[PDB]
């Protein structure tokens, strides 16, 4: 395409119990 | 006769000295044995008497 | 008596207003009108516009 | 000509304009204040100011 | 003027621009007030150039 | 929601307005300088500047 | 007398004045 591969880390979302939280650098 | 000013600018011309050279010369001239000195070409006290 | 007979037509519609995303309201890609983002102590520009 | 450590001009202008930061427009005087900034790794000669 | 050096027509220039490979501008990398083109003379000024 | 280590309890603004530190109007350009400061423990995104 | 293209210093500036790395 016209240039767009300028994307995120190809992580996935962090695992949790009760749908959400924050773990930072852990 | 009249005069009025619109915009007075200051233009300062810097030599494009190499950065390492530039900060070698900074070190040297931030010392009190290398402190600059100037004098007037006419060093004088000026007095007008009527 | 002959200026009873006259005709008239509205003037052309002309719409004026700022461009699509404010195009041309800032110099980009220009000489001597380049932007600046720089350190405050460093003073060296970190923007180069071609 | 010498090379190494005599000149680098990596995105730095040889001439910088400085516009006033305060101005006064009295009948018999016009005052202008500037912020004259000399960046890191630069030396300015004040004999090229006008 | 070619051979006698009796030039008299240098005041007609108003710009020269130097590029290498059509993507490098030789006085470029910020040097001049308008970096990428020399301007011998400017008519219609506003920056006090 | 996460209950700690995602928001400060300190007095901090979410919006800041930087007034010009120098400005000069030309005949067809307007030049505006600022000092954009980012405090310690504040991270700025340039997406949100306008 | 002196004229242009002859204003030669030969010598550099800085790395002769001893420096050694961290």
PDB file of C-alpha atoms in Angstrom:
ATOM      1  CA  UNK A   1       0.000   0.000   0.000  1.00  0.00           C
ATOM      2  CA  UNK A   2       0.901   3.645   0.572  1.00  0.00           C
ATOM      3  CA  UNK A   3       3.070   3.540   3.705  1.00  0.00           C
ATOM      4  CA  UNK A   4       1.350   2.365   6.954  1.00  0.00           C
ATOM      5  CA  UNK A   5       3.222  -0.620   8.635  1.00  0.00           C
ATOM      6  CA  UNK A   6       4.063   1.984  11.373  1.00  0.00           C
ATOM      7  CA  UNK A   7       2.155  -0.104  13.960  1.00  0.00           C
ATOM      8  CA  UNK A   8       2.304  -1.169  17.657  1.00  0.00           C
ATOM      9  CA  UNK A   9       4.275  -3.898  19.394  1.00  0.00           C
ATOM     10  CA  UNK A  10       2.535  -7.161  18.288  1.00  0.00           C
ATOM     11  CA  UNK A  11       1.729  -8.106  21.832  1.00  0.00           C
ATOM     12  CA  UNK A  12      -1.560  -9.499  23.052  1.00  0.00           C
ATOM     13  CA  UNK A  13      -3.578  -8.156  26.037  1.00  0.00           C
ATOM     14  CA  UNK A  14      -2.336  -9.143  29.549  1.00  0.00           C
ATOM     15  CA  UNK A  15      -4.108 -12.101  31.390  1.00  0.00           C
ATOM     16  CA  UNK A  16      -6.527 -11.319  34.312  1.00  0.00           C
ATOM     17  CA  UNK A  17      -9.225 -12.638  36.703  1.00  0.00           C
ATOM     18  CA  UNK A  18     -12.370 -10.414  36.584  1.00  0.00           C
ATOM     19  CA  UNK A  19     -11.734  -9.001  33.031  1.00  0.00           C
ATOM     20  CA  UNK A  20      -9.342  -6.034  33.865  1.00  0.00           C
ATOM     21  CA  UNK A  21      -6.446  -4.625  36.049  1.00  0.00           C
ATOM     22  CA  UNK A  22      -2.937  -3.007  35.579  1.00  0.00           C
ATOM     23  CA  UNK A  23       0.433  -4.854  36.002  1.00  0.00           C
ATOM     24  CA  UNK A  24       2.865  -2.318  34.378  1.00  0.00           C
ATOM     25  CA  UNK A  25       6.412  -3.642  33.651  1.00  0.00           C
ATOM     26  CA  UNK A  26       5.742  -7.040  35.452  1.00  0.00           C
TER      27      UNK A  26
ATOM     28  CA  UNK B   1      11.024  65.861   9.601  1.00  0.00           C
ATOM     29  CA  UNK B   2       9.986  62.833  11.601  1.00  0.00           C
ATOM     30  CA  UNK B   3      11.163  59.295  12.106  1.00  0.00           C
ATOM     31  CA  UNK B   4       9.354  56.209  13.321  1.00  0.00           C
ATOM     32  CA  UNK B   5      10.485  52.605  13.630  1.00  0.00           C
ATOM     33  CA  UNK B   6       8.620  49.477  12.733  1.00  0.00           C
ATOM     34  CA  UNK B   7      10.507  46.358  13.753  1.00  0.00           C
ATOM     35  CA  UNK B   8      14.085  46.385  14.967  1.00  0.00           C
ATOM     36  CA  UNK B   9      15.714  42.959  14.630  1.00  0.00           C
ATOM     37  CA  UNK B  10      18.999  41.576  15.911  1.00  0.00           C
ATOM     38  CA  UNK B  11      21.102  39.411  13.550  1.00  0.00           C
ATOM     39  CA  UNK B  12      23.913  37.353  15.074  1.00  0.00           C
ATOM     40  CA  UNK B  13      26.362  35.453  12.837  1.00  0.00           C
ATOM     41  CA  UNK B  14      27.739  32.233  14.339  1.00  0.00           C
ATOM     42  CA  UNK B  15      30.743  30.380  12.894  1.00  0.00           C
ATOM     43  CA  UNK B  16      29.750  26.696  12.336  1.00  0.00           C
ATOM     44  CA  UNK B  17      32.557  25.376  14.540  1.00  0.00           C
ATOM     45  CA  UNK B  18      32.811  21.591  15.059  1.00  0.00           C
ATOM     46  CA  UNK B  19      31.027  20.566  18.258  1.00  0.00           C
ATOM     47  CA  UNK B  20      34.008  18.934  20.009  1.00  0.00           C
ATOM     48  CA  UNK B  21      36.222  21.919  19.107  1.00  0.00           C
ATOM     49  CA  UNK B  22      33.514  24.263  20.287  1.00  0.00           C
ATOM     50  CA  UNK B  23      33.320  22.699  23.735  1.00  0.00           C
ATOM     51  CA  UNK B  24      37.066  22.428  24.067  1.00  0.00           C
ATOM     52  CA  UNK B  25      37.073  26.194  23.689  1.00  0.00           C
ATOM     53  CA  UNK B  26      34.203  26.499  26.206  1.00  0.00           C
ATOM     54  CA  UNK B  27      36.303  24.801  28.884  1.00  0.00           C
ATOM     55  CA  UNK B  28      39.281  27.028  28.276  1.00  0.00           C
ATOM     56  CA  UNK B  29      37.313  30.286  28.366  1.00  0.00           C
ATOM     57  CA  UNK B  30      35.456  29.277  31.515  1.00  0.00           C
ATOM     58  CA  UNK B  31      38.552  29.808  33.553  1.00  0.00           C
ATOM     59  CA  UNK B  32      39.854  32.929  35.231  1.00  0.00           C
ATOM     60  CA  UNK B  33      43.329  32.796  33.666  1.00  0.00           C
ATOM     61  CA  UNK B  34      41.596  32.996  30.298  1.00  0.00           C
ATOM     62  CA  UNK B  35      39.230  35.846  31.081  1.00  0.00           C
ATOM     63  CA  UNK B  36      38.840  38.308  28.212  1.00  0.00           C
ATOM     64  CA  UNK B  37      39.887  41.935  28.436  1.00  0.00           C
ATOM     65  CA  UNK B  38      39.075  44.967  26.321  1.00  0.00           C
ATOM     66  CA  UNK B  39      39.983  48.627  26.398  1.00  0.00           C
ATOM     67  CA  UNK B  40      38.744  51.804  24.745  1.00  0.00           C
ATOM     68  CA  UNK B  41      40.760  53.221  21.877  1.00  0.00           C
ATOM     69  CA  UNK B  42      40.217  56.558  23.582  1.00  0.00           C
ATOM     70  CA  UNK B  43      40.496  55.834  27.258  1.00  0.00           C
ATOM     71  CA  UNK B  44      39.521  59.093  28.836  1.00  0.00           C
ATOM     72  CA  UNK B  45      37.537  61.193  31.252  1.00  0.00           C
ATOM     73  CA  UNK B  46      35.641  63.779  29.252  1.00  0.00           C
ATOM     74  CA  UNK B  47      34.758  67.111  30.778  1.00  0.00           C
ATOM     75  CA  UNK B  48      33.176  70.155  29.199  1.00  0.00           C
ATOM     76  CA  UNK B  49      33.867  73.501  30.832  1.00  0.00           C
ATOM     77  CA  UNK B  50      32.073  76.662  29.719  1.00  0.00           C
TER      78      UNK B  50
ATOM     79  CA  UNK C   1     -38.649  55.570 -20.052  1.00  0.00           C
ATOM     80  CA  UNK C   2     -36.260  53.030 -21.537  1.00  0.00           C
ATOM     81  CA  UNK C   3     -34.585  52.316 -18.169  1.00  0.00           C
ATOM     82  CA  UNK C   4     -37.881  50.792 -17.100  1.00  0.00           C
ATOM     83  CA  UNK C   5     -36.665  47.940 -19.265  1.00  0.00           C
ATOM     84  CA  UNK C   6     -33.769  46.414 -17.433  1.00  0.00           C
ATOM     85  CA  UNK C   7     -32.933  42.909 -16.452  1.00  0.00           C
ATOM     86  CA  UNK C   8     -31.181  41.623 -13.469  1.00  0.00           C
ATOM     87  CA  UNK C   9     -29.564  38.384 -12.518  1.00  0.00           C
ATOM     88  CA  UNK C  10     -28.080  37.484  -9.112  1.00  0.00           C
ATOM     89  CA  UNK C  11     -24.306  37.550  -8.713  1.00  0.00           C
ATOM     90  CA  UNK C  12     -22.372  34.248  -8.844  1.00  0.00           C
ATOM     91  CA  UNK C  13     -22.328  32.321  -5.500  1.00  0.00           C
ATOM     92  CA  UNK C  14     -18.850  32.625  -3.976  1.00  0.00           C
ATOM     93  CA  UNK C  15     -18.061  30.758  -0.739  1.00  0.00           C
ATOM     94  CA  UNK C  16     -14.926  31.680   1.173  1.00  0.00           C
ATOM     95  CA  UNK C  17     -13.536  29.937   4.253  1.00  0.00           C
ATOM     96  CA  UNK C  18     -10.409  28.178   5.579  1.00  0.00           C
ATOM     97  CA  UNK C  19      -9.101  25.082   3.712  1.00  0.00           C
ATOM     98  CA  UNK C  20      -9.742  21.370   4.395  1.00  0.00           C
ATOM     99  CA  UNK C  21      -7.510  20.769   7.432  1.00  0.00           C
ATOM    100  CA  UNK C  22      -6.174  24.327   7.499  1.00  0.00           C
ATOM    101  CA  UNK C  23      -4.054  23.626   4.450  1.00  0.00           C
ATOM    102  CA  UNK C  24      -1.453  26.304   3.776  1.00  0.00           C
ATOM    103  CA  UNK C  25      -1.941  28.034   7.132  1.00  0.00           C
ATOM    104  CA  UNK C  26       1.524  26.936   8.226  1.00  0.00           C
ATOM    105  CA  UNK C  27       4.760  26.728   6.342  1.00  0.00           C
ATOM    106  CA  UNK C  28       5.763  23.147   5.792  1.00  0.00           C
ATOM    107  CA  UNK C  29       8.447  22.137   3.345  1.00  0.00           C
ATOM    108  CA  UNK C  30       9.765  25.635   3.036  1.00  0.00           C
ATOM    109  CA  UNK C  31      13.024  27.552   3.109  1.00  0.00           C
ATOM    110  CA  UNK C  32      13.532  30.119   5.836  1.00  0.00           C
ATOM    111  CA  UNK C  33      10.172  29.383   7.369  1.00  0.00           C
ATOM    112  CA  UNK C  34      11.086  25.995   8.822  1.00  0.00           C
ATOM    113  CA  UNK C  35       9.623  25.045  12.174  1.00  0.00           C
ATOM    114  CA  UNK C  36      11.667  24.377  15.270  1.00  0.00           C
ATOM    115  CA  UNK C  37      11.539  21.806  17.949  1.00  0.00           C
ATOM    116  CA  UNK C  38      14.752  21.727  19.859  1.00  0.00           C
ATOM    117  CA  UNK C  39      16.180  21.462  23.354  1.00  0.00           C
ATOM    118  CA  UNK C  40      16.266  24.668  25.392  1.00  0.00           C
ATOM    119  CA  UNK C  41      19.942  24.349  26.255  1.00  0.00           C
ATOM    120  CA  UNK C  42      21.074  22.400  23.193  1.00  0.00           C
ATOM    121  CA  UNK C  43      19.354  24.848  20.810  1.00  0.00           C
ATOM    122  CA  UNK C  44      20.048  22.529  17.860  1.00  0.00           C
ATOM    123  CA  UNK C  45      16.949  22.036  15.739  1.00  0.00           C
ATOM    124  CA  UNK C  46      15.495  18.517  15.640  1.00  0.00           C
ATOM    125  CA  UNK C  47      13.230  19.300  12.682  1.00  0.00           C
ATOM    126  CA  UNK C  48      14.466  19.236   9.099  1.00  0.00           C
ATOM    127  CA  UNK C  49      11.907  20.059   6.426  1.00  0.00           C
ATOM    128  CA  UNK C  50      12.782  19.222   2.837  1.00  0.00           C
TER     129      UNK C  50
ATOM    130  CA  UNK D   1      42.369  22.813   3.866  1.00  0.00           C
ATOM    131  CA  UNK D   2      42.252  21.244   7.345  1.00  0.00           C
ATOM    132  CA  UNK D   3      39.631  18.541   7.927  1.00  0.00           C
ATOM    133  CA  UNK D   4      38.286  16.881  11.107  1.00  0.00           C
ATOM    134  CA  UNK D   5      37.082  19.099  13.961  1.00  0.00           C
ATOM    135  CA  UNK D   6      37.065  22.449  11.999  1.00  0.00           C
ATOM    136  CA  UNK D   7      33.409  22.748  10.919  1.00  0.00           C
ATOM    137  CA  UNK D   8      30.110  20.923  11.240  1.00  0.00           C
ATOM    138  CA  UNK D   9      26.773  22.481  10.310  1.00  0.00           C
ATOM    139  CA  UNK D  10      24.405  19.669  11.152  1.00  0.00           C
ATOM    140  CA  UNK D  11      21.118  21.525  10.978  1.00  0.00           C
ATOM    141  CA  UNK D  12      22.380  24.822  12.365  1.00  0.00           C
ATOM    142  CA  UNK D  13      22.074  28.164  10.631  1.00  0.00           C
ATOM    143  CA  UNK D  14      24.982  30.545  10.235  1.00  0.00           C
ATOM    144  CA  UNK D  15      22.623  33.490  10.880  1.00  0.00           C
ATOM    145  CA  UNK D  16      19.874  33.600  13.490  1.00  0.00           C
ATOM    146  CA  UNK D  17      17.415  36.481  13.686  1.00  0.00           C
ATOM    147  CA  UNK D  18      16.165  37.385  17.138  1.00  0.00           C
ATOM    148  CA  UNK D  19      12.925  39.323  17.342  1.00  0.00           C
ATOM    149  CA  UNK D  20      12.170  41.519  20.415  1.00  0.00           C
ATOM    150  CA  UNK D  21      10.567  40.081  23.562  1.00  0.00           C
ATOM    151  CA  UNK D  22       9.656  43.516  24.936  1.00  0.00           C
ATOM    152  CA  UNK D  23       9.193  46.797  23.112  1.00  0.00           C
ATOM    153  CA  UNK D  24       8.511  50.361  24.222  1.00  0.00           C
ATOM    154  CA  UNK D  25       7.505  53.177  21.912  1.00  0.00           C
ATOM    155  CA  UNK D  26       8.028  56.395  23.862  1.00  0.00           C
ATOM    156  CA  UNK D  27       8.251  59.764  22.107  1.00  0.00           C
ATOM    157  CA  UNK D  28      12.034  60.091  22.362  1.00  0.00           C
ATOM    158  CA  UNK D  29      13.137  56.486  22.863  1.00  0.00           C
ATOM    159  CA  UNK D  30      12.382  53.053  21.546  1.00  0.00           C
ATOM    160  CA  UNK D  31      13.465  50.170  23.783  1.00  0.00           C
ATOM    161  CA  UNK D  32      13.800  46.606  22.591  1.00  0.00           C
ATOM    162  CA  UNK D  33      14.820  43.629  24.670  1.00  0.00           C
ATOM    163  CA  UNK D  34      15.917  40.357  23.111  1.00  0.00           C
ATOM    164  CA  UNK D  35      16.787  36.962  24.433  1.00  0.00           C
ATOM    165  CA  UNK D  36      20.100  36.265  22.794  1.00  0.00           C
ATOM    166  CA  UNK D  37      20.664  32.562  23.052  1.00  0.00           C
ATOM    167  CA  UNK D  38      23.916  30.886  22.274  1.00  0.00           C
ATOM    168  CA  UNK D  39      23.307  27.159  22.047  1.00  0.00           C
ATOM    169  CA  UNK D  40      25.503  24.432  23.480  1.00  0.00           C
ATOM    170  CA  UNK D  41      28.642  23.836  21.424  1.00  0.00           C
ATOM    171  CA  UNK D  42      28.605  27.247  19.787  1.00  0.00           C
ATOM    172  CA  UNK D  43      30.613  30.390  20.313  1.00  0.00           C
ATOM    173  CA  UNK D  44      29.200  33.723  19.177  1.00  0.00           C
ATOM    174  CA  UNK D  45      31.299  36.764  18.344  1.00  0.00           C
ATOM    175  CA  UNK D  46      29.564  40.014  19.284  1.00  0.00           C
ATOM    176  CA  UNK D  47      31.410  41.881  16.564  1.00  0.00           C
ATOM    177  CA  UNK D  48      29.029  40.366  14.003  1.00  0.00           C
ATOM    178  CA  UNK D  49      25.890  41.601  15.768  1.00  0.00           C
ATOM    179  CA  UNK D  50      23.978  44.470  14.216  1.00  0.00           C
TER     180      UNK D  50
ATOM    181  CA  UNK E   1      34.156  40.172 -21.515  1.00  0.00           C
ATOM    182  CA  UNK E   2      35.022  36.523 -22.148  1.00  0.00           C
ATOM    183  CA  UNK E   3      38.701  37.284 -22.689  1.00  0.00           C
ATOM    184  CA  UNK E   4      39.220  40.788 -21.281  1.00  0.00           C
ATOM    185  CA  UNK E   5      37.382  40.184 -17.998  1.00  0.00           C
ATOM    186  CA  UNK E   6      35.208  43.241 -18.616  1.00  0.00           C
ATOM    187  CA  UNK E   7      32.043  41.842 -16.986  1.00  0.00           C
ATOM    188  CA  UNK E   8      29.192  44.252 -16.381  1.00  0.00           C
ATOM    189  CA  UNK E   9      26.101  42.090 -16.353  1.00  0.00           C
ATOM    190  CA  UNK E  10      26.263  40.316 -12.993  1.00  0.00           C
ATOM    191  CA  UNK E  11      23.433  42.314 -11.474  1.00  0.00           C
ATOM    192  CA  UNK E  12      20.854  40.471 -13.580  1.00  0.00           C
ATOM    193  CA  UNK E  13      21.103  37.250 -11.527  1.00  0.00           C
ATOM    194  CA  UNK E  14      18.385  36.812  -8.933  1.00  0.00           C
ATOM    195  CA  UNK E  15      18.845  33.196  -7.879  1.00  0.00           C
ATOM    196  CA  UNK E  16      21.050  30.204  -8.346  1.00  0.00           C
ATOM    197  CA  UNK E  17      20.139  26.857  -6.832  1.00  0.00           C
ATOM    198  CA  UNK E  18      22.501  23.930  -6.679  1.00  0.00           C
ATOM    199  CA  UNK E  19      21.365  20.354  -6.208  1.00  0.00           C
ATOM    200  CA  UNK E  20      23.192  17.045  -6.594  1.00  0.00           C
ATOM    201  CA  UNK E  21      21.177  14.088  -7.892  1.00  0.00           C
ATOM    202  CA  UNK E  22      18.029  16.251  -7.629  1.00  0.00           C
ATOM    203  CA  UNK E  23      17.447  15.449  -3.960  1.00  0.00           C
ATOM    204  CA  UNK E  24      20.460  16.968  -2.197  1.00  0.00           C
ATOM    205  CA  UNK E  25      20.625  20.743  -2.010  1.00  0.00           C
ATOM    206  CA  UNK E  26      24.228  21.790  -1.779  1.00  0.00           C
ATOM    207  CA  UNK E  27      24.122  24.862   0.583  1.00  0.00           C
ATOM    208  CA  UNK E  28      21.465  22.806   2.407  1.00  0.00           C
ATOM    209  CA  UNK E  29      21.621  21.348   5.903  1.00  0.00           C
ATOM    210  CA  UNK E  30      20.671  24.826   7.169  1.00  0.00           C
ATOM    211  CA  UNK E  31      23.205  27.510   6.515  1.00  0.00           C
ATOM    212  CA  UNK E  32      21.586  30.377   4.678  1.00  0.00           C
ATOM    213  CA  UNK E  33      18.414  32.159   5.829  1.00  0.00           C
ATOM    214  CA  UNK E  34      16.653  30.456   2.937  1.00  0.00           C
ATOM    215  CA  UNK E  35      18.732  27.265   2.977  1.00  0.00           C
ATOM    216  CA  UNK E  36      18.226  25.496  -0.314  1.00  0.00           C
ATOM    217  CA  UNK E  37      18.629  28.342  -2.789  1.00  0.00           C
ATOM    218  CA  UNK E  38      21.027  31.252  -3.008  1.00  0.00           C
ATOM    219  CA  UNK E  39      19.252  34.484  -3.779  1.00  0.00           C
ATOM    220  CA  UNK E  40      21.457  37.141  -5.342  1.00  0.00           C
ATOM    221  CA  UNK E  41      18.718  39.714  -4.860  1.00  0.00           C
ATOM    222  CA  UNK E  42      15.209  39.791  -3.490  1.00  0.00           C
ATOM    223  CA  UNK E  43      12.547  42.228  -4.639  1.00  0.00           C
ATOM    224  CA  UNK E  44       9.423  42.064  -2.475  1.00  0.00           C
ATOM    225  CA  UNK E  45      10.850  41.506   0.980  1.00  0.00           C
ATOM    226  CA  UNK E  46       9.136  41.190   4.340  1.00  0.00           C
ATOM    227  CA  UNK E  47      11.600  39.329   6.516  1.00  0.00           C
ATOM    228  CA  UNK E  48      14.172  42.118   6.179  1.00  0.00           C
ATOM    229  CA  UNK E  49      16.475  39.766   4.275  1.00  0.00           C
TER     230      UNK E  49
ATOM    231  CA  UNK F   1     -10.540  -0.173  37.010  1.00  0.00           C
ATOM    232  CA  UNK F   2      -6.902  -0.325  38.305  1.00  0.00           C
ATOM    233  CA  UNK F   3      -6.812   1.359  41.711  1.00  0.00           C
ATOM    234  CA  UNK F   4      -3.158   2.476  41.978  1.00  0.00           C
ATOM    235  CA  UNK F   5      -0.142   3.308  39.748  1.00  0.00           C
ATOM    236  CA  UNK F   6      -2.326   4.714  36.849  1.00  0.00           C
ATOM    237  CA  UNK F   7      -3.182   8.228  38.088  1.00  0.00           C
ATOM    238  CA  UNK F   8      -1.447  10.724  40.335  1.00  0.00           C
ATOM    239  CA  UNK F   9      -3.101  12.144  43.440  1.00  0.00           C
ATOM    240  CA  UNK F  10      -0.843  15.235  43.185  1.00  0.00           C
ATOM    241  CA  UNK F  11      -2.042  18.594  41.878  1.00  0.00           C
ATOM    242  CA  UNK F  12      -1.363  18.415  38.168  1.00  0.00           C
ATOM    243  CA  UNK F  13      -3.119  20.079  35.267  1.00  0.00           C
ATOM    244  CA  UNK F  14      -4.485  18.086  32.379  1.00  0.00           C
ATOM    245  CA  UNK F  15      -4.323  21.143  30.117  1.00  0.00           C
ATOM    246  CA  UNK F  16      -1.694  23.848  29.825  1.00  0.00           C
ATOM    247  CA  UNK F  17      -1.618  26.956  27.722  1.00  0.00           C
ATOM    248  CA  UNK F  18       1.804  28.199  26.731  1.00  0.00           C
ATOM    249  CA  UNK F  19       1.770  31.896  25.898  1.00  0.00           C
ATOM    250  CA  UNK F  20       4.375  33.102  23.316  1.00  0.00           C
ATOM    251  CA  UNK F  21       7.815  34.062  24.619  1.00  0.00           C
ATOM    252  CA  UNK F  22       8.488  36.048  21.452  1.00  0.00           C
ATOM    253  CA  UNK F  23       6.344  36.902  18.472  1.00  0.00           C
ATOM    254  CA  UNK F  24       6.838  39.182  15.504  1.00  0.00           C
ATOM    255  CA  UNK F  25       4.401  39.925  12.740  1.00  0.00           C
ATOM    256  CA  UNK F  26       5.938  40.343   9.298  1.00  0.00           C
ATOM    257  CA  UNK F  27       4.126  41.550   6.190  1.00  0.00           C
ATOM    258  CA  UNK F  28       2.747  38.141   5.231  1.00  0.00           C
ATOM    259  CA  UNK F  29       4.057  35.750   7.887  1.00  0.00           C
ATOM    260  CA  UNK F  30       3.616  35.548  11.626  1.00  0.00           C
ATOM    261  CA  UNK F  31       6.386  34.026  13.737  1.00  0.00           C
ATOM    262  CA  UNK F  32       5.540  32.642  17.166  1.00  0.00           C
ATOM    263  CA  UNK F  33       8.015  31.023  19.568  1.00  0.00           C
ATOM    264  CA  UNK F  34       7.109  29.260  22.831  1.00  0.00           C
ATOM    265  CA  UNK F  35       8.870  27.468  25.608  1.00  0.00           C
ATOM    266  CA  UNK F  36       7.139  24.136  25.872  1.00  0.00           C
ATOM    267  CA  UNK F  37       8.038  22.586  29.192  1.00  0.00           C
ATOM    268  CA  UNK F  38       7.323  19.087  30.349  1.00  0.00           C
ATOM    269  CA  UNK F  39       7.696  18.677  34.090  1.00  0.00           C
ATOM    270  CA  UNK F  40       9.281  15.751  35.865  1.00  0.00           C
ATOM    271  CA  UNK F  41       7.044  12.689  35.908  1.00  0.00           C
ATOM    272  CA  UNK F  42       4.810  14.142  33.203  1.00  0.00           C
ATOM    273  CA  UNK F  43       4.814  12.600  29.746  1.00  0.00           C
ATOM    274  CA  UNK F  44       3.472  14.678  26.872  1.00  0.00           C
ATOM    275  CA  UNK F  45       2.157  13.462  23.532  1.00  0.00           C
ATOM    276  CA  UNK F  46       2.474  15.795  20.563  1.00  0.00           C
ATOM    277  CA  UNK F  47      -0.766  14.396  19.114  1.00  0.00           C
ATOM    278  CA  UNK F  48      -2.673  16.433  21.673  1.00  0.00           C
ATOM    279  CA  UNK F  49      -0.885  19.750  21.049  1.00  0.00           C
ATOM    280  CA  UNK F  50      -2.560  22.344  18.817  1.00  0.00           C
TER     281      UNK F  50
ATOM    282  CA  UNK G   1      51.475  40.862  -1.349  1.00  0.00           C
ATOM    283  CA  UNK G   2      49.005  38.258   0.139  1.00  0.00           C
ATOM    284  CA  UNK G   3      45.851  37.358  -1.821  1.00  0.00           C
ATOM    285  CA  UNK G   4      43.154  34.568  -1.887  1.00  0.00           C
ATOM    286  CA  UNK G   5      43.239  30.701  -2.020  1.00  0.00           C
ATOM    287  CA  UNK G   6      46.542  30.849  -0.015  1.00  0.00           C
ATOM    288  CA  UNK G   7      45.256  31.245   3.616  1.00  0.00           C
ATOM    289  CA  UNK G   8      46.507  27.813   4.753  1.00  0.00           C
ATOM    290  CA  UNK G   9      46.623  26.668   8.444  1.00  0.00           C
ATOM    291  CA  UNK G  10      47.458  22.945   7.614  1.00  0.00           C
ATOM    292  CA  UNK G  11      46.919  21.899  11.311  1.00  0.00           C
ATOM    293  CA  UNK G  12      43.570  20.729  12.770  1.00  0.00           C
ATOM    294  CA  UNK G  13      42.213  21.698  16.228  1.00  0.00           C
ATOM    295  CA  UNK G  14      41.306  19.052  18.894  1.00  0.00           C
ATOM    296  CA  UNK G  15      42.244  15.293  18.839  1.00  0.00           C
ATOM    297  CA  UNK G  16      46.010  16.089  19.154  1.00  0.00           C
ATOM    298  CA  UNK G  17      45.228  17.516  22.636  1.00  0.00           C
ATOM    299  CA  UNK G  18      45.048  14.187  24.490  1.00  0.00           C
ATOM    300  CA  UNK G  19      41.626  12.595  25.126  1.00  0.00           C
ATOM    301  CA  UNK G  20      40.869   8.995  26.202  1.00  0.00           C
ATOM    302  CA  UNK G  21      37.556   7.154  26.307  1.00  0.00           C
ATOM    303  CA  UNK G  22      35.167   5.883  29.029  1.00  0.00           C
TER     304      UNK G  22
END
